[PDB]
Amino acid sequence: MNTPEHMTAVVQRYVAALNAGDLDGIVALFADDATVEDPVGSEPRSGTAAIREFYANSLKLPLAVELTQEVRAVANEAAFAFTVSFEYQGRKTVVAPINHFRFNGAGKVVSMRALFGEKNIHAGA
Amino acid sequence: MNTPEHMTAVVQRYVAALNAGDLDGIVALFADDATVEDPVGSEPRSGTAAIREFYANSLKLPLAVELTQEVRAVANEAAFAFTVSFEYQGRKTVVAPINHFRFNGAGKVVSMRALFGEKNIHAGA
């Protein structure tokens, strides 16, 4: 069936799969056709194919991804605020996006939009 | 015309028109042809007429709405994380939704969705 409980489950694992570098795991909450539009607007990674590797291209640095708030889940949809912190060449950065998770009627996730902009990134000089 | 910088203002002015019960303000921020979905799951209201009367009923009990984090906007699209606090029969109650708006080239909120479930309503007894 599904359930907010399950969508607040799938969200916790998605962050954990990420927060570990775990790449197979990030691919398993999704369906085989689900879409990815990150950042929101750009051309969308479709099929498991461009997804894994999209998650690949970003996981190249130890990303610390914690949930900065309570997940909100209702009617196949799941929203959640969070952080993405990463270092490279002595500087500290922090992306603050909001994902919008559309789950299909099977239990898996079927579209991931993630909202952030130049404002929602906090890097030092 | 648009820009992420404009959306944070429309967010901020929604939050304001909520606290102070500024109805015109609220309805102003929207499209003359926009819809409301509070919560996601419910049937859509539409036409300024259908929106005002809705927002009319949300402001019977005073609303201490508060934004809990930086609002995130990219691609004519804006999401935020907030709480709508309010009291009835001495009970402190709070809502903790994540909303999503979507603008147009005109900068008028042409779609409001409110996302929160039972786990995201914080009142004791």
UniProtKB/Swiss-Prot annotation, chains A, B:
A Pfam family hit: SnoaL_2
Keyword Oxidoreductase: no
An individual GO BP term: steroid metabolic process
Gene induction: By steroids.
Catalytic activity: a 3-oxo-Delta(5)-steroid = a 3-oxo-Delta(4)-steroid
Effect after changing F116W: Slightly lower activity at neutral pH. Increased catalytic activity at pH 3.8
Gene3D superfamilies for this protein: 3.10.450.50
Protein EC: 5.3.3.1
Keywords, comma-separated and alphabetical: Isomerase, Lipid metabolism, Steroid metabolism
Gene Ontology molecular function terms on file: steroid Delta-isomerase activity
Binding site for substrate: N99
Active site: Y14, D38
Quaternary state and interactors: Homodimer.
NCBIfam families: SgcJ/EcaC family oxidoreductase
Protein name: Steroid Delta-isomerase
Organism: Comamonas testosteroni
